[PDB]
Amino acid sequence: DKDVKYYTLEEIQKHKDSKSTWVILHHKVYDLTKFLEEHPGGEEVLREQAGGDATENFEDVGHSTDARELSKTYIIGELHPDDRSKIAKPSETL
Template identity: 70%
Template sequence: MDNDKTSDGGVKFYTLEDVRVHNMINDTWLIIHDKVYDISKFLEEHPGGEEVLLEQGGADATESFEDVGHSSDAREMLQQYYIGELHVVRKVHFPHVLSAKKKCDLGVTCSLIKNDISFSYFYFAVSFLHVLANLSHFFLMKNLPHTHTQKKSMIA
């Protein structure tokens, strides 16, 4: 369903979900550089054919638009189909996840999905194993007979 939210300047804002439903031949919207365009009336006039536009209908077509290398005239013509802006929901980032690559030890490259909590469990497990290894080393060194002291007693 279309979003009727407007800013103080009268600009309409649409969510990605609003745009997605407009992907048919008689109702085609595109997003290009976070601007929303209703190109329904332009489909038949498009020099590359309507199929190209229909493939991108209801989605962000920025990359495809730029890959083609549209002329300044085409960019200017696009403005007549402008209907609003894409409402971008701010993402919440967790610092421990954003800096996760910096936290990886032993040259291990961590491939993470942002905000994936599984890294926290991984990092905890690695830290726990590190502590366990140090404790084991400490107790082994304390309880093993010292070979260098035995050699000295043999020499004397």
């Protein structure tokens, strides 16, 4: 609509005890407030994280057989580069 507006990490983790929330694909934001009712499966969408917090594919099934990832009709912007791990160090959680 205008341009990729990046949101700080505090803006992405601000939704939780309300109703609508977004998700991160390692470098993007996903306003999926409508996905909560756009794809009703087995509560497996917007809740697939465990390996160091990672969401490879969270698209349930039912919408015309195994459909493709709808990563485009539910995105709002990208992740601010100030938090992206590609400036000073790469990673370190040991």
